[PDB]
Amino acid sequence: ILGDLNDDGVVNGRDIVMMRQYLAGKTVSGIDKNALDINGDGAVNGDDLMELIKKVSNN
Amino acid sequence: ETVKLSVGTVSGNPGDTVKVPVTISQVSTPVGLICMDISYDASKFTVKDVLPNTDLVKDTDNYSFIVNTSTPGKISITFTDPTLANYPISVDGILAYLDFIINSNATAGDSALTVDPATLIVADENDKDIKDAASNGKITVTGS
Ligand SMILES: [Ca+2]
Ligand SMILES: [Ca+2]
Incomplete structure (x- = not known):
């Protein structure tokens, strides 16, 4: 599931925190690297964070 | 605590x-x-x-x-x-205001505003859960 960075089966604020930590350079343990590229453009960056925020805000 | x-x-x-x-x-x-x-x-x-x-x-x-x-x-x-460090909530206070319209058809009396106990998450800046609980509120629809 794209945006489920901790693979706990839901997309919520915990996933936002994990995306922010990854984009801040943190080694985030338990991170699903496959869930990071939410918009599928090959890169993990602030646009994926924005798409994650939109999922939490609107889904 | x-x-x-x-x-x-x-x-x-x-x-x-x-x-x-x-x-x-x-x-x-x-x-x-x-x-x-x-x-x-x-x-x-x-x-x-x-x-x-x-x-x-x-x-x-x-x-x-x-x-x-x-x-x-x-x-x-x-x-x-x-x-991820500079703006935690460290003191008690009001987090937010819910702005509701009371619909024209609303009948009188109490109506609960219920916090789901199962989906409540509160965590610290180190990502560790904080012992937490919820308390419900209500809107009472009255005359004018
Ligand atoms: Ca999740
Ligand atoms: Ca991307």
Whole structure:
């Protein structure tokens, strides 16, 4: 599931925190690297964070 | 030492708006994440807005405060610290205001605003859960 960075089966604020930590350079343990590229453009960056925020805000 | 997320108690008549405070209390460990769901009777009330108290909630220009009102009868609030260190909630206070319209058809009496105990998340800046609990509120529909 794209945006489920901790693979706990839901997309919520915990996933936002994990995306922010990854984009801040943190080694985030338990991170699903496959869930990071939410918009599928090959890169993990602030646009994926924005798409994650939109999922939490609107889904 | 259980941190509490509490929804307030207000009254009003049909056609008016009411502002319901959501309060955090018994803060000890500084809070970096809050996820909460509040249910309400959509036949009686329409959510107009959910507004953060920016005295307590900082960095709202960078999505520290995310509101989901996509589904009638449920409000999901997500508080975060986008800086991961500088803006935790470390004191008690009002987190937000729920702005409801009392629908024209609303009948009189009490109507609960219920926090889902199962989906309540409160965590510190180190991502560890903080012992937490919720307290429900209500809107009483009255005459004018
Ligand atoms: Ca998740
Ligand atoms: Ca991407």
